[PDB]
Ligand binder design. Structure first.
Ligand SMILES: Nc1ncnc2c1ncn2[C@@H]1O[C@H](COP(=O)(O)OP(=O)(O)OP(O)(O)=S)[C@@H](O)[C@H]1O
Ligand SMILES: Nc1ncnc2c1ncn2[C@@H]1O[C@H](COP(=O)(O)OP(=O)(O)OP(O)(O)=S)[C@@H](O)[C@H]1O
Ligand SMILES: Nc1ncnc2c1ncn2[C@@H]1O[C@H](COP(=O)(O)OP(=O)(O)O)[C@@H](O)[C@H]1O
Ligand SMILES: [Mg+2]
Ligand SMILES: [Mg+2]
Ligand SMILES: [Mg+2]
Ligand SMILES: [Zn+2]
Lengths: 395, 310, 209, 105
DNA sequence: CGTCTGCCCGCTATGAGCGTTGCATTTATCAGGGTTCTGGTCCACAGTAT
DNA sequence: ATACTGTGGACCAGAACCCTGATAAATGCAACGCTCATAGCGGGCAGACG
């Protein structure tokens, strides 16, 4: 599944991180000056590509959405929070000084008596913390998380011990708010990231749901799972009779009793689940003006995007009118901003006019982006009653 | 299996396999047997296990633990290794690497006493405090499960509780401290505690790996020792002075407890068979008693070296 | 390993390990009935071989696959149409093994994501997407989530074809409207006799031939 | 009513009414082969009419019943010979009700 | 105010998930034999009494 | 010096665990039935124009 990395131990300068192998085998923390440049990506554009055939220049344009990433202000904060809550969940699970072994003995009682509040030892404490991410659709929650978690080795192997530390894992909810198909998703991800077979071992012998919930929290401690991410938590609203509260409590017990940190990602529609009953981060689309002066983020984004053109008769520089129409049509949602550019270039190639103007942008938006019109119209209106249905803005 | 625990210091492999199913939440013994071994015909044995090699395969990446280290460091093999001889030691070592369980016991004929006895799960309540304050875990220790001494070489008696190894054949059991605490003082004998302390350093001695005498070396050693000691008849025993020394060193109650009560009247005695020409291997108790009664100032390893070199 | 060792030593400040693939592309083709949406696809995809065999490897690359939605609107029958069609493209049997009644929708949807990577599929086109509405198996929100989680797993691109009544199915929320028009949306119209102020040339060309 | 909870519980010492009492005795017979321990018993018991039907009630009193121990010494066959001999002398079908189902002793 | 227009509404058919059942498989019980293993036994020899 | 006491040594037969076969009893799995949500048609009954 994933390549194992033999661990080399470093020397952390923090007193609390004294002799914990699980947080000396991790890559070092980085400063914010280089954390905003370790995530940047772009496409090559060799200068000889402007003279190639139209079919090649058309198949090269299509890879812009998949290879262009620009770090923003909030990505640094999210990265720092993730790093702290990954390295802070191991201080209570030291494997050397008899502290992880006190957690694995308690877990056998839980799987044996079928209850998650059964304890044998009382000095086995856990520190996990938690997070919750909320933003509109297309804002970039998952593509800016796969990029952040891409600096960690996932599976690591220690020779002094015989443990395979799994640094992070990622799953998502079922299409209904089912209970038996989240445990199986966890097992499938776990044995697809290692190569083992836990879906045949657990979960195919006709266990009750409580037994499965007890077995899920023990194999997550056999391999020291540093972080768990559940994507699309808004699927929980369609749960069974009273089942929405059960897993909402279960994701609280693991953070509090077992010790595994948990992160949740969702849309504004998923705020209602938590409102009825975790830290909160709210993400919103780019605003053109917030200080009374043009936003530097928008200028930087458009200026860096504009330099990725394969058109022969390309414009010298981006004029104000093109920027204004680009913001008018897209309103700041990340996916539309790049897709509109890609489609405009793809039409300019075939139509014969190898340039970009405001009229071409409007025509492409009118022709090829029909299903997305009402949501962007509601965003442009700026009326709370219209946004009360869809458009995914938190009131 | 992905995460097989490394053995703790001075632990039997039975406890390691038992913990390898507590660390992962396997409750039914058949599932644990099917995962670790792949067969449901294996028999749990405390001391002198078989089917080794599959245990060394799980600990392959940690380069240190091989079959030799598991055999000579985490079992009871060194108690039987030197006294049997050079002829059967290699065969037993070869046999323990494969799927022959009872054949190993047959080859180690001193352990081939047909039905055994005292299969109850022993423990020492004083050592468990150190185990919990040093490791956070409690496990079976090779000091406790001596073949015939229910005594700890550093604290005294052992607290039994009535669960038998052969009660459930396919189940690996791990000690739990909440169940464990049933300490009550018992009668204690200082002579047997001293014997246990004398016999303990044999387990952690590297000399027993490559040094083992033969039967004629044993009888030559005994006859030279008797002749130099001076309490002998004409090429025979006095039968009284040696027995008197044995009774002076050890009380009759101790030998009655050890199931080696002296029998002066009958012609067939274990001491007499020791003196006469050797025909079969003897247990460690008889050799230890003879050495202690006849050599009161020499250690076990040096005594064995003296017996084997000449 | 070399990058990890050097970043731990301190020579190299940054290193990027393995990452995850992006969401699959998707397209929506909407047009009135009788316009030729099945004929066009069957003539366009006919230039591509279906099953190509690679000698150095041991994969039978299934270049494309075509299935159709079920009249019930059921979500568990469009998981068996996949196996049934792939057993005809190849000579294998998968509806006998993975098409049991013990497995749920969430398990079949993950079993069909492994045989779509053993044989590297290139497309999955679903025809007659109109038949989804008013299904007794579940609500509208239990299928608008099934589509999102099916796009976010399989990895192969998907193409959806339907009549102009299927606009209201995918125009209910931004999460599904963004994915429906993943690579543009194509709307088809009947031929017009008069284009601007002069007679059409396409109509005359089609009629004369 | 006392016998229903013995079926439910599985323990044959429970009770609901303390007033219920038993008034039965026991007998044992041993003799060498050829003495006539079977034909004499048959001749003695042939006086009574076995099944008798009552009209005011609806019961069918069974005066006596004879079974034999299985050769194998099995514990599940003595409980099946009883049902076979009962539905042979009544015409009912109790072996299918009780014997066929998965029941412990 | 009553039959037609809306309304109610009991009813009916369908499908995905969960709980139950019968057959084949595994597991356990018991008798028989046997084959080497070892455990006590008797014979011949050395050294001592007439 | 030579005949009797003690003893070393070579040694057979009871016996314990392993292998084989036949019969009875305890599980595991593939198959089948129970239950809950969802959609709709048509008939029978509260308020209409006449
Ligand atoms: N900072 C960024 N720079 C460039 N492209 C970005 C950036 N953030 C997001 N994107 C684009 O956003 C798209 C990915 O969208 P997602 O990250 O999946 O949105 P989302 O949050 O997953 O929406 P859902 O359906 O609610 S999960 C790609 O086209 C990326 O190129
Ligand atoms: N008083 C008797 N008069 C005539 N014949 C008798 C008498 N008692 C016994 N018999 C005969 O003896 C036989 C009765 O013995 P069985 O019916 O075989 O029972 P049994 O004597 O208990 O032997 P078992 O049941 O095998 S131990 C029949 O052949 C009878 O005809
Ligand atoms: N461009 C075309 N040229 C010739 N015939 C066409 C064309 N487009 C459609 N047709 C005819 O229309 C008929 C019906 O098309 P069909 O495949 O049923 O489309 P749909 O399934 O969308 O109705 C076909 O038999 C085909 O012959
Ligand atoms: Mg996403
Ligand atoms: Mg068609
Ligand atoms: Mg009779
Ligand atoms: Zn002790």
């Amino acid at each position: 599944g994933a390549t194992r990395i033999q661990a080399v131990y470093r020397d952390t300068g923090v007193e609390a991180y004294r002799d914990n192998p699980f947080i000396e085998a991790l890559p070092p923390l980085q400063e914010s000056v280089n954390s905003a440049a370790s995530l940047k990506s772009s496409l090559q554009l060799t200068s000889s590509d402007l003279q190639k055939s139209r079919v090649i220049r058309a198949h090269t344009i299509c890879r812009i959405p998949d290879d262009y990433f620009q770090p923003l202000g909030t990505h640094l904060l999210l990265s720092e929070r993730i790093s702290v809550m990954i390295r802070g969940g191991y201080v209570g699970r030291n494997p050397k000084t008899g502290d992880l072994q006190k957690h694995l003995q308690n877990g056998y009682e839980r799987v044996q008596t079928g209850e998650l509040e059964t304890f044998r030892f009382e000095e086995a404490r856990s520190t996990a913390q938690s997070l919750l991410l909320i933003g509109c659709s297309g804002s970039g929650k998952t593509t800016s998380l796969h990029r952040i978690l891409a600096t960690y080795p996932q599976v690591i192997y220690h020779r002094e011990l015989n443990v395979e530390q799994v640094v992070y894992l990622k799953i998502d909810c079922s299409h209904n708010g089912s209970l038996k198909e989240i445990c199986l998703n966890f097992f499938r991800a776990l044995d697809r990231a290692l190569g083992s077979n836990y879906e045949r071992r657990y979960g195919l012998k006709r266990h009750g749901i409580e037994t499965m919930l007890a077995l899920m929290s023990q194999i997550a401690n056999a391999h020291a799972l540093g972080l768990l991410v559940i994507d699309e938590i808004q699927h929980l609203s369609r749960s069974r009779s009273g089942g929405s509260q059960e897993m909402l409590n279960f994701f609280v017990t693991m953070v509090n009793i077992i010790g595994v940190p948990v992160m949740l990602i969702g849309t504004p529609k998923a705020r209602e689940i938590f409102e009825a009953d975790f830290g909160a981060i709210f993400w919103d689309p780019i605003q053109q003006t917030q200080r009374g002066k043009p936003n530097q983020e928008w200028i930087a984004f458009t200026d860096n995007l504009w330099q990725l053109q394969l058109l022969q008769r390309k414009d010298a520089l981006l004029s104000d009118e093109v920027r204004d129409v680009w913001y008018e049509l897209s309103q700041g949602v990340m996916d539309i901003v790049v897709k509109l550019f890609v489609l405009a270039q793809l039409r300019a190639l075939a139509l014969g006019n190898e340039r970009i103007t405001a009229g071409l942008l409007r025509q492409v938006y009118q022709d090829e982006l029909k299903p997305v019109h009402p949501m962007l119209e509601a965003l442009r209106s700026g009326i709370p009653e219209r946004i009360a249905r869809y458009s995914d803005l938190v009131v | 299996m992905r995460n097989f625990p490394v053995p703790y210091s001075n632990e039997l492999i039975y406890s390691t396999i038992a913990r390898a199913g507590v660390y992962q939440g396997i409750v039914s013994p058949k599932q644990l047997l099917d995962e670790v071994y792949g067969n449901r015909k294996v028999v749990a044995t405390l001391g002198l296990p078989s089917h080794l090699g599959v245990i060394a395969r799980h600990l392959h990446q940690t380069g240190r633990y091989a079959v030799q280290q598991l055999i000579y460091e985490h079992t009871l093999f060194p108690l039987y290794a030197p006294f049997v001889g050079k002829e059967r030691r290699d065969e037993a070592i070869r046999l323990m690497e494969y799927q022959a369980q009872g054949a190993v016991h047959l080859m180690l004929g001193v352990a081939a006493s047909r039905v055994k006895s005292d299969n109850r799960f022993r423990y020492c309540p004083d050592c468990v405090a150190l185990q919990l304050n040093r490791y956070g875990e409690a496990f079976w220790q090779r000091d406790w499960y001596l073949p015939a001494l229910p005594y700890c070489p550093k604290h005294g008696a052992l607290v039994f509780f009535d669960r038998a190894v052969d009660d459930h054949r396919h189940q690996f059991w791990a000690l739990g401290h909440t169940e464990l605490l049933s300490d009550y003082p018992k009668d204690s004998l200082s002579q047997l505690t001293a014997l246990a302390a004398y016999i303990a350093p044999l387990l952690d001695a590297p000399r027993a790996q490559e040094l083992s005498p033969s039967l004629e070396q044993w009888t030559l050693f005994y006859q030279r020792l008797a002749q130099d000691l001076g309490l002998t008849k004409s090429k025979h025993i006095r039968h009284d002075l040696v027995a008197e020394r044995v009774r002076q060193t050890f009380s009759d109650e101790a030998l009655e407890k050890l199931d080696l009560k002296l029998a002066e009247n009958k012609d067939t005695c274990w001491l007499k068979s020791i003196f006469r020409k050797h025909r079969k291997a003897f247990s460690y108790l008889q050799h230890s008693i003879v050495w202690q009664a006849l050599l009161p100032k020499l250690t076990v390893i040096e005594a064995l070296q003296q017996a084997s070199a000449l | 390993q070399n990058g990890y060792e050097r970043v731990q030593t301190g020579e190299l400040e940054t290193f990027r390990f393995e990452e995850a693939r992006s969401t699959a592309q998707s397209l929506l083709l909407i047009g009135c009935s009788g316009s030729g949406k099945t004929t066009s696809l069957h003539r366009i995809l006919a230039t591509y071989p279906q099953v190509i065999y690679h000698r150095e490897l041991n994969v039978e690359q299934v270049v494309y696959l075509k299935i159709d939605c079920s009249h019930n609107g059921s979500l568990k029958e469009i998981c068996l149409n996949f196996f049934r069609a792939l057993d005809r493209a190849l000579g294998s049997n998968y509806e006998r093994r993975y098409g049991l009644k013990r497995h749920g929708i969430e398990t079949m949807l993950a079993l069909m994501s492994q045989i779509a990577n053993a044989h590297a599929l290139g497309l999955l086109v679903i025809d007659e997407i109109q038949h989804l509405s008013r299904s007794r198996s579940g609500g509208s929100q239990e299928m608008l989530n099934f589509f999102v989680t099916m796009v976010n797993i399989i990895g192969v691109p998907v193409m959806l074809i339907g009549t102009p009544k299927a606009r209201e199915i995918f125009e209910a929320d931004l999460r599904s409207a963004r994915r429906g028009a993943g690579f543009g949306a194509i709307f088809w119209d009947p031929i017009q006799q008069t284009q601007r102020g002069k007679p059409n040339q396409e109509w005359i060309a089609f009629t004369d031939n």
